[PDB]
Subunit: 370 residues, 4 copies
């Protein structure tokens, strides 16, 4: 019986930059829930590495490129989207706002991109569907120890309009998240979307014990099985080593999702962006690549595409915007990324999004302190 008082205000916000939104959202979100969202593993040195990796590869300004009115629109697996970013799957939007995942979904569908719905969302998929208003959605799952539980949840996703499946596999056990331990934080909501399918070790499960209850012993046959049952495109999420990309494709994955889980999993690992080129090279344009874990600016969207990604996923900045203004606050953030990217396209000489994929990047061996 835990009291949780999330903000409920709905409103547009001014976004000068997304970094300032973290301090701003701290003032309106309960301490434990805010720090669950903002924190990462150990020292949080790898979360800083996710941010600072963007300074390793620098953009060139380009002059007399015959560019005017850049077009940020793109296409992924047949989905026409307004900008080359989507919403990453996160199950804890209820910590940021009372409208939970329905608030984000509405912002994302109004904006005109893809909403990734974690199966373990605190919002009911009737609250969420109203938010989406017909909009494209993907479903994120953990592998469960029970095969029937897996079939049922996959069926549930398809029945809920899902057009791809995201299997997050970098999470077989939890990362060592010092804020959450120190704050003795307990996630207060349930999982309405999948509660009726929970079997065995997943019985009575929440986000509090989800890592241990789910499947540790994931292998490539799991990727194949999931793909076979659903028949929807499968993204394998959490990839940081290029060998795992080879494996995922050989296993029948329809996309590669480069991520370190916002640095909330393995500690003393590289910043996610540093891992991307090796992965893109191994993929060799075989399947679409989504990249996340550290995206905060339009320069970062540009850098990632230039480095081999097709689209990027946004996380924390959108949740901070949702805390600050509900669906409209989240929308303000997506609007921000869109306008930010179109300036960067103009100044780097990119007419459209495919042009971004071919930018020259300046190598900065000096790193952050320069």
């Amino acid at each position: 019986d835990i009291e949780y008082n999330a903000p409920s205000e709905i409103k547009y916000i001014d976004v000068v930059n997304t970094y300032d939104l973290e301090e701003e959202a701290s003032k309106v979100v309960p301490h434990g829930g805010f720090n669950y969202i903002a924190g990462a593993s150990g020292d949080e040195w790898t979360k800083r590495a996710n941010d600072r990796a963007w300074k390793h590869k620098l953009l060139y300004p380009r002059l007399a490129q015959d560019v005017e009115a850049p077009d940020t629109s793109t296409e992924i697996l047949g989905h026409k989207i307004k900008a080359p970013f989507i919403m990453a799957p996160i199950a804890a939007h209820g910590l940021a706002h009372t409208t939970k995942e329905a608030g984000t979904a509405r912002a994302v569908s109004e904006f005109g991109t893809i909403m990734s719905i974690s199966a373990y969302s605190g919002a009911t998929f009737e609250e969420i569907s109203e938010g989406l208003n017909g909009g494209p959605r993907w479903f994120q799952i953990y592998m469960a120890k029970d095969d029937q539980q897996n079939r049922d949840i996959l069926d549930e996703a398809k029945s809920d309009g899902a057009t791809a499946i995201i299997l997050t596999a970098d999470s077989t056990v939890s990362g060592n998240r010092d804020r959450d331990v120190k704050n003795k934080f307990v996630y207060p909501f349930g999982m309405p979307i999948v509660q009726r399918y929970l079997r065995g070790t997943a019985e009575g499960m929440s986000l509090n014990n989800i890592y241990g209850a789910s499947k540790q012993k994931i292998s490539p046959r799991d990727i194949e099985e999931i793909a076979a049952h659903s028949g929807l495109p499968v993204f394998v999420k959490g990839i940081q080593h290029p060998e795992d990309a080879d494996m995922a494709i050989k296993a029948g994955a329809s996309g590669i999702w480069v991520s370190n889980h916002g640095a909330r999993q393995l500690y003393e690992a590289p910043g996610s962006f540093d891992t991307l080129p090796a992965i893109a090279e191994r993929v060799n344009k075989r399947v679409p690549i989504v990249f996340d874990s550290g995206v905060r600016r339009g320069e970062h969207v540009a850098k990632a595409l230039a480095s081999g990604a097709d689209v990027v996923a946004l996380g924390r900045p959108v949740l901070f915007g949702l805390a600050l203004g509900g669906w409209q606050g989240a929308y303000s953030v997506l609007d921000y990324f869109q306008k930010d990217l179109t300036r960067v396209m103009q100044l780097t000489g990119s007419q459209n999004v495919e042009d971004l994929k071919g930018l020259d990047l300046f190598d900065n061996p000096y790193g952050y302190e320069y």
Copy 2:
């Protein structure tokens, strides 16, 4: 309502970095942060500064050097040191004597004044500060072809001997200080009023840049050259292929610059880009370098890395804020003296000596 400083006096310059905080005391908040500020969290502005520690000067002994000669020459103009004034908008934000005051200091010193299209002063006000001194005109292009012809023709009539095409501001950088301060201009821009719906007064740079031409292409470099019949510099080059592009479209000079980190964010420090560009230029045309020059050591490093002159921006505008034409003059004199000390200590008798200096590579970076 905009209360710019108006005192004219020489200033003591120990270094140029100190002038920033000094100007912040006398310049109104809005205008001051417009001058001082850069894009994003200003990391590339800091990279502009720190890029200077990446290549270090060697002191050289028994070099047979005395009373170094800082004088040089670029496109026919004999100048007293290898720097010119950078084209900078709206000097009225720093001092009431505006562009006419900077023009006076630059001309008394004996280098070239660059005139920004976004000047708050008319060609005639600037020209009476210059008193016959050399000037280049920096154009922010209108969309309309005849307006460009008219702006170029006024510039040339007034006595401009080069044109500078600034092509790195087709849209504005993300300059957070200005967004947060809600910065608008307190006065108009005579040279470009013709394509602004309004004067410029009460307008944002976003919308003034938005009024200028976005779809610049190599044709614009060819056409400006052919119309004006003057050397054309292409300004804002950070990528070597743009330098080759420019020269091939008919440019007579390359101006390496990142707009003092006021444009594209998360891009390199301007000085780190210089050798690759100078390599591609391969001595076909002269190179101006700018963005982060603060010391004589910086002038020397810039020349040793392939530049022919550097342009000075923020320090001279801080000088103007603090002392009008005499203040700006104080800054120019500082640079000349600072370079003079560096030339003696590095074993360089003239500017040409500076272009051949060895540099120590520093792979450690700023923290060493």
Copy 3:
């Protein structure tokens, strides 16, 4: 000297926080004796930042569940790839002294390393051990007969390997201790003997000064010959000293810079490990120490050529905080911390850890 005496299990969210916590319970002189290092402690900071030079890869669909941290060094089967480092005078941290540490170590299921400069007798220690494995760390006497006596008493006590620490012929420049004028507040039974009196009221400079300075390879061969025990050479940072130690009949290489308490303006210990491993060529086992604070550091060490790592400061901050139970909590933490890292990197057993790809970070700490 009022060392704490409370015995309780500890929560370890991370080992770094233990240092500040132990600060409030351990007397000033002794705390800083434990915490401090040479010079301005730059090399101690190097020990810690070296871990960011090589970074771990998360791995997926690895077919891994319940990872197994157990391994075997020499004869001994141990529950995780780490051991207790030899550390003097545990009485500075807790009244239960070395007996407290010995209990936590044997209950956990690893090897206790006994310092020659302990404040507890072989008898006090054997009692906390309850038949648990032990290695004896010698700081040599100048007198040969005394070295034989010491070695005999240790082997008689149950030691199954000898560790010759050779990186302390002379004390390091430990500014904290100089400024605090630190002297031991109790005696050292084992080396008494060659101290011309007691170790009580003596400084470490002079206790080290009493020990042998002219250690040569002959000492390694003589220790081994007399012992009939596996001999470790501790304090190696240069690959040439590993050739040397093996040539002289060493059965193990212990890679260490003494927790940065000795040669100042030297590298972080982790950065020296690969060249040493390269040179040793698995001829003898490698113990690595100096800066281990996380399970990630255990996995990186092993992945870089170590066979086990030795834990020091954190166990002693644990002991200060909770006696044998606090110390146990630290050991339990490292084991649980490594099991997590093993799951996330896709390692089923300790041998997999040794085969991990690492990611090169040329940028260093600030990235």
Copy 4:
């Protein structure tokens, strides 16, 4: 000018602490003239962080006991491989000025470098030196007669070598001195101050002093290997690697980073002195392993002199010898020659690691 006057032994745990200690006792302008450097002092910091680029290895079972720090330079037998750097106006630090430093150096047992610009006469310095060995540092004057006048004067005082400091034909940009409007509170008996000296120093000037003084000549301020090669060919008998304690050219390398390239070029043709940022025994070791034969000490000796006069400067020289002895034991060096053969660990990460 109120300089400190107390004489006393100091205990030094490190030389770094002396700067803040001396600052409480030395007049503000004089103190900042000593402690300060060119520009925002980034190259002073580089002089200090340079030592972190090459790291010492501990070595074990090296059969070493009681290391010997004594060595020999140009026939001079000294108690440790360091000497006193020539420094102006010791009277800024202490009322006993250059005599006090002289006595500390003499009694410890090494070579005193006498600056042309000292506030003490040769006779005052000779009194402190008490027979102890001395070298004379010259800023060349424009007038040839004036140069050989001071050279003969140095010789007759018993100078056994000449230091040609050539890295200072004009002053560095010392912001502390300009901002403090610092002026010397006394004169220079022996000889705006930099401008009166020779600016147009050429190789000839080296070959002239070499050939005419009858003394061995060090050329001081070298940071580029080509100036070492020039100086040897011009008749120099020693190369002195220095950036003048970062008081001259700004935005130049840390002195220690320049050493290996110069030593490789000199190629043991003549002795090498090294200075600019030596603060620990670890530093003396590293400089010797990087190709120096001796190092010269500057600011830490002056802070010692400020804190306890001749005896305070002695405590600093005593510290360095004790520091090096510890380093020698731990690196496996029985003697100074061994130090020169030490391997160094390359640290590409620099200071922040």
